[model samples]
Target chain A: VMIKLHGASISNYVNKVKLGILEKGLEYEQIRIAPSQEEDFLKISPMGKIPVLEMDGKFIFESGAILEFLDTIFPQTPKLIPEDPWEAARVREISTIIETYLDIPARRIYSPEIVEEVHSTLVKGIKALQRVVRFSPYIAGNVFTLADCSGFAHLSVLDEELRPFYPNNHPLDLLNGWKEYFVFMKTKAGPALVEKDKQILKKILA
Target chain B: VMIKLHGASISNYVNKVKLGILEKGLEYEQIRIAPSQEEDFLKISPMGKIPVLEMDGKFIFESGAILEFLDTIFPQTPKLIPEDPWEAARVREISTIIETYLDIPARRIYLSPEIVEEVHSTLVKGIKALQRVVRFSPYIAGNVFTLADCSGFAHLSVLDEELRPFYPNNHPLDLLNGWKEYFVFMKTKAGPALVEKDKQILKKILARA
Candidate 1:
């Protein structure tokens, strides 16, 4: 089956999927496109969000769903989701917290007051992650699961994006053991490729 | 395992989990609570949001996580999740679109018409996307009730009432092809009916207060 990834590498979401593909050693064609509300794009992505996975000509939107589908279809690959039910739920749980409570709020860090509020909100999410995130080697567990894919993509972007505004006080910077975990993540093939592409994209935009 | 669901009856999310619990015929206790920012509630819920599912004293927050967890734990019960991989993804996909695009945007209608128009337009796009995927043959996903219906009923029920004054003539969900019939169809079910009963009761109590 031919797999095509639609969206630019600049999007942490698109990169998250891209990293997943790389980790599995699966081959996919990357289609560089920005998120748009165009009629045709809407046919694929209801919210016009990027990071859609195209397989067998059927388009699957939503980063979480796309990643889940990939793991389901390619059972031979390094499993992005765990086989244990409780562990699988934990994977989803971690990703949900990162996307919903952290990344979304961080997107609108426009004002000082907003930054303060967003930071405050992020504190709770990190506390939550502390209770669940193993970080022994991975965000969810020892292996490179989907939560790491999410943590690497979302947090790396967040760290860079929030740096200038919050030179001293970025949430990721304050997260205990995050710096070491991130450095450990950068040593991997898939995460390394993702960060390299993101760097190039950043340079192009700059 | 002892199952206890925390969060008030008025919360649509709380009801979503409640409906699933009832649908599975699993016996559990309900702890009436509201979203709070206190230290103790934060320990369980993290974000201090409800409903939190307590099973054997461990806590699970996030309705999406809780629903998925319940289905995984109770395999003998009526599966809120479909066993087929593709079908299961579709169930999660539908719930995501409803909550992210429709429900979240519609939430801001109480804020402004600038927001109202934004909310209205986003709802249009969301319903368009939903129409393309939903089976609605007898339920949101298909012939049997899945997690999608739990989400579809709970979120849309709240959205329906929320948008009534704003849209006045036609609600946002009314735009979806079979929503009217689907709503009526679901109302006949035990879980949907139970949610509505508590919802309306809470609404009247809040009004009186």
Candidate 2:
């Protein structure tokens, strides 16, 4: 029963999978490794991407796929996704809008030194996030589904790293509940596991 | 037993749903409508997107959602998607990669001229599609899954319409196989019914050229 999460502490995409592991209440070990374009990681993940989960010896890549696999394996705890087809699709739509349109574009700023393009893109991403986000104490209308977990990980990255660049921009009213929801996440097993992950990442990078 | 599909003949997204109906061997009414931004259509679909399926008066928007809903409701025919969790995720991964990364980006090229910068973006999308397309045989995975038919039709539109005219010089290895396989599927059980249903839209596309 060795479920290992192979990712980095600094990688938000890794956190996306980590949050799912927490919600499932599944005990697993976190193996921190730097994201490299080398063959070692590529053998396990052909894409050479972070957040690859190894269950017993088989590997699963892609954060979205990893999360879906986790939910199916452990259906006892709080369900990260809805069972109904339409509702499940709604969850996927919200997650996609955030991951593709919001987070990916916003994170592109960090890759470059220029601040203006980063700020503009991050604002666009946030505005898009606001449109699909139906926050009633959590994302997706009152329930703490994987959508909420996604919002927590993505929004935290934006506020902590990107917000200082543009101070005049007001907080989005729709995202007001997200602050409390994020705080709630820290008290749970997910963030605790993330803390352990951070230590491993620091050692690997050093 | 009333299954009504409100869609345009030329829409690839609508065709994915139509493929599901054919694969499941379900009988339903196909309604052809003009693609418009009118409030009536927008009320059912906020995005005013085509391929809205109405089953017993309940509305299901989004092609991906509609396909899964149909599979759940009618399990009589051969299952298009796998029952195993990991395998099912793989099918979905293929669908999402094509839709979000390839189709949507390619769509922006034709949707508006304002995003002309997307011409380069579309080329990159083509390269990505070539890289990820793993065809064991004529089908995407060599085994006929439901996701294969949906994506097969969608990719056909990209090759014939979007990629060729936009970037004629940049030809990839998988382009020919994609076209050949899609044509084969269209002539088979999955496509004949849709061809009949949306004959007018096909006529319009051909009439333009």
Candidate 3:
């Protein structure tokens, strides 16, 4: 069965699922589509969000759910979720903190003018991430898990955007070992592909 | 092998996890604690959010993660997550749309003022999205009771309470078919009823304070 991924490369959510697909060494077709409120798009992704996965004509939305489904279905592939339940939860927990606390808050920084309110919220969000993230060289632990798929996709975007705004003391700068971990992620084939696609999208948008 | 839940009842997230624990017929102790950023609490809940589950002297946070973990660890219990992979993802997808799209945008009504138009439009879109997916066939996900109901009942009920004063005549959820009946049906159950009971108690407490 051919796996088809729907969404743009620029979207972190799309790239997150892409990361998982690549890491699993799965061959998939990527469709470059923007988030749309059109009836067709809404049917696939209830929230009209990017990165809807289609397998054997069946569709799945939400990056977290998609990744979980992928890992479950492709059991013979390299597992992103740990076999142990608690370890698996920790992997999910890291992704949850990144997506909910870090990614969402950072998205608000996109406003025309940088609001202190948004900045301060991100400050606390980074602190919260610091408390959870292992960076023991992955966002979750030693091995690359789904959290890294989420981490690299979101944080790489956050790191790029915050450069023009905070310059020196960005939210990521405060999350100890993130800089090193980010560099480490780039060397991986999957993260490298995602980063390369993001750069290409940036050049086109620029 | 005792399960201890931490968080105030007023929070929809805490109530969501509590619903799962109760529905699975697992005996769990409830502890009254508010979301705190203090160091001790951060160790357990890195984000200082509520509905943390303490099991075997270990703590797991985030309502989604906790619920998934509970279902996995207690395989003998009534499964909150479906045995089928696709069905399981649908349950998680439903919860994500509710918490991420509907509840999060609705929450902005209280946090930062004067975003009424923006938040309202967002909620309207969210309601439309929810309508496309939610199959309220006596339950949020259809047939069996799952974590989606726990999510739908708690988040929607709290959002309903929060949105009433703002859109008193125009409840956002009213746009979604059968949500009202589903809400009523959920309240008849023990877990959902207990959640509403404690939430009402906390609402009074907050009002007094």
Candidate 4:
């Protein structure tokens, strides 16, 4: 059975799962669907969310869960998680930090009426990201794990979509190293897929 | 090296980790501390959160990560997560639903008047819980896994501490049947140590009531 990813190009989460599939060297088809409130997307995702994956007629939603599934399923090219329990736990911790503290807070920083609140939230997010990010070579460390994938996907979206809102907002000092690391990842096959996804999204929106 | 769980009794996240350690049949020292905004605590947890675990002098924070670590390090016992990729993924998905969609949203219902905008948030929270909770069986499923235990403990705490006020005053059916299953699980799995700790916290909360 062919693996199908039902996603839209505009969603960072869709790219997140796509990046995971690419990193694992897995083959899958991308099925684009326009997100509509009246459509059955809500039936597939009770939360009316996107980036749902269908494999062998079974459906799976949620980006983080999908990434974990891909990593565990394809362990050949390189492991996305650490073999040691403690290190694996660290990876998970960093992922959560990116999701809850960094990404969520950064997204909240764009609320139209709350400039000061958004600025403070952005600063807090940067501080929290710096704490969890182990920028040896990747976001997590020397190994290129799912943590890097999650961090890069989230931070890139923030830079592209939300950074324009904060004219005075400077990049976090600690993230200078991470900026270099992200540029390095962009040179790889996986990041190329993300760029392609952006074009696809633009076409859909147009 | 001894495992040390730096946690407070009232925290649902801490309780989940404690329950995991119990299920794994592992012995660990529990250091109970009052929830506070202390500098030392903030250093260990950037969010200044409770439930940081110290093993061999290295600190690990975040309840989900800590529980997964406990399960991974002691995989010999009955596992909280399934070994199969799909099944494990499903378990994680379900746990995330409880954590993010249900529990966290539900928590916002009880925020002090300073933070929340309206009473409608609590009502919406109730409806959402009722809608999502149908997936939960007598034990969140027939089989007893750590997923059910952790989720059960956390959800029950939310209902008792936060949801009860909204019910009868705002709506009804405060505790669902799944709650009874959870109570049974707690009694069976949590043992005397946890029971004593729970009772102490309950007494304090009740006194405040």
Candidate 5:
């Protein structure tokens, strides 16, 4: 059986996983399923989260865990985890900080109140992202690691959905080189995954 | 040069790394520094967080990162990380979940009311003397492959993520492995009750938040 990815592309977490797969130059079938509180789905994933990976009839949940699993099993694909322990840890540290601080909180900023939005958690997160971006080349230090896949999904999407809310409070204007990095990464693979998002969004809206 | 671990023993993270050191049979000095915003602490640990590991004066911060570093060098000690790649991944999953879900929110209690006691009574009151005795000490308390490979993975995770505003991290009990080890060494009478109480404390903290 081919590896089947389960989740709607509109989900940033799902798209994050999709970006990891595509950026690594791997292939899998995508399945569109809204996460329901149904007993069956909950049995498979206690949280009923989407973006599940079903391969060889075995299941893996959590995009980060699945990303590492795929990276390990498919060692030849450009190394997501570098050989040096320190570097791998650095990659993980950045990937996690993005996941913990940036990706999730920014996801919460999608609202109608552009004039006076009040997400102080996200305000603090934007400042923290500014502090960490000294190495403008990639999300982590030197290499284009899994963190970029994360930065690709959340940072770029945040630019789209959140810019209007606090047009002046935008994340790109908050720091240097972020705009350049986002453009570079999108030209690489962001457009393709985003097309998938647009495709899914069209269906939901239609 | 010997290994030096910074961060107070009371810290869930600091003690988590210490658990790995004990199980691995590595000798290390524990410096009980409550992590602060002081420039010196921040220099060593940019986050100024607990559980920084220093070796030959170079520092590696982050408890999970530090644990992996120890296992890489002192591999001859009981392998905190397993051999199989999938197994190591599973262990890492649990470890990260514990940190992401349990450790971080619990640490945030410092920002809130200090309701840490009842939840962590697992580590302190009962295991007080044992923490010293077991310091020189398969670790989670039972079975091989009981993957708390993360020493700290056991005492907490998942429910805390949902219960608190904090987001996510972690694994199911069957995959989590080696929990009963510490409990077996301590009191059985209070063990199960404490798990339920720990859940309540989690709810209480969430309620307060």
Candidate 6:
């Protein structure tokens, strides 16, 4: 049975899930719901967050878990994860660093919320990102692994949010692999993934 | 060959790996190193973070990665993760919440270099979010000694030790089910190890200071 992916298309996490689906060439259904605190959605996504996956009768929340489940069931697909165990561990390491450092830390890097904020805290995050980031042609390097799914969805979001604070801040380009990957992304699932992102956004605003 | 875990005992992440080793009853060797920026050290851990695991000859960084690797190698040992796919996802959801919302946000609450302290927003956000979470009793979620417990124990210990001073009304602790008792139960396992290790690290840090 095919799985039903819950959550809105505009969500970076939802987009991350969809990238895996498209990369794997899987036929998946979508259930668009904004992040909700209602009891109905709460039963499915305990955290009340977006990007919940429903397979058969059971459901999976969190993008990392969903990506792992997809690859596990459909190993014939892109296999976003590496077969070599060490390489796979490295994949997790990148995803962890991206999620923990790049994506979340810059969530409010230069938002309209606070005019007189101390960017030192956020500059610290950028410095940390600058330290750990290695594009290696893909996030995990030389392969379009699951780590790319996260980068495709979240890295651009970080760039948008954080650039206003440090407008010249383009640390992502410091790594040649990531620089190649960013340009290389448009060739693959990246372009389609973002089109879907724009489509959902336009649908709501229009 | 015995695995070598690199990092000092004072680090919360190092304690996490040690807890997994002790839980699985596996033997591991450790090398003490504080977070470093030296070229050699950066080669080992790009972020210069603690809890680097060396298996065979290759070094593995990231505590979560290390734990997953240990379970893979020693399947017969007590599995810290759920066997079921769905349950595994749920365990991660809780872990994500703890790591993203409860743990890191609270870490910077009152402590930073800012002359002004504004924790009302943080407290409000944390309380509203945590109160909704079940915190999954007996263990972190299920009966199994999942990785969630390691993440949970380490995260909450910081919350208890640091947050209580200002947020002394104990609202979040009360919202948390069996938190104190749960911590007491886990102490018999990994709590004291972390506590003892932290004391030693503090002495080292303090002596250097």
Which portions of model 5 show Cα errors greater than 4 Å? Answer: A107-136, A194-206, B38-40, B56-58, B96-142, B145-154, B157-182, B185-209
- Count the clashes in each prediction: 0, 1, 0, 0, 4, 2
Considering summed lDDT, which 10 consecutive residues are worst modelled in model 5 chain A? A110-119
Off by over 4 Å in 6: A110-137, A160-168, A189-191, A199-206, B110-137, B190-209
* TM-scores for every candidate against the unseen true structure: 0.94, 0.76, 0.95, 0.86, 0.71, 0.83
Higher-DockQ candidate among 2 and 3? 3
Q: What is the DockQ of each candidate?
A: 0.62, 0.25, 0.75, 0.51, 0.17, 0.40
| TM-score for chain B considered on its own, for each of the candidates | 0.95, 0.79, 0.95, 0.76, 0.59, 0.82
Over A3-92, each residue of candidate 5 has an lDDT whose tens digit, in order, gives: 789998777778878877876677788898987757577555444577788887766666777777877787764677777776666666
Between candidates 4 and 6, the one scoring higher on TM-score is 4
How do all the candidates rank in terms of DockQ, highest first? 3, 1, 4, 6, 2, 5
- Where does model 5 sit among the CAPRI classes? incorrect
Model 3 lDDT, residue A23, Cα: 92
Residue-level lDDT tens digits of model 1 in A1-206 = 38899999989899889988999999889999999989888888877889888887678888888887888787764788887767777788888888888898887872768878888887777777676788878888888788888999998877778888777767776567788889999999989989998899889999
Question: Top lDDT: which candidate number?
Answer: 3
Model 6 TM-score (2 dp): 0.83
Q: Model 1 scores what on Cα lDDT?
A: 0.84
Error of 4 at A133 (Å): 1.9
Cα lDDT of model 3 by residue, A1-206, tens digit: 39999999989999999999999999999999999878777778877788999998899988999999998888754688877888888888889888888788787776545556677777888887786678887888887788889999988888888788887768777889888998998999989989999899899999
Off-target runs (Cα >4 Å) in candidate 4 are A34-44, A109-113, A171-174, A203-206, B34-39, B112-138, B169-177, B191-199, B202-209
Angstrom error at residue B50, model 3: 0.9
- Assess the local accuracy of residue B162 in candidate 4 as a C-alpha lDDT between 0 and 100: 67
Q: Identify the CAPRI category of the predicted complex in candidate 1.
A: medium
Model 2 C-alpha lDDT per residue in residues B1-209, reported as the tens digit of each score? 58999886677787777777876778888787756556676556545567888865667666766776677667665565567776666666566556655666666664544465465555454445434545535555446646655765655554455555655665432444465664565566545445544655576777989
The sequence of per-residue lDDT tens digits that candidate 1 reaches over residues B93-181 is: 99888888888778777425677787777788789888888989888899988888888888888888778889887577888888889
Point out the worst 10-residue segment of candidate 5 chain B by lDDT.
Answer: B128-137
Error of 1 at B186 (Å): 0.6
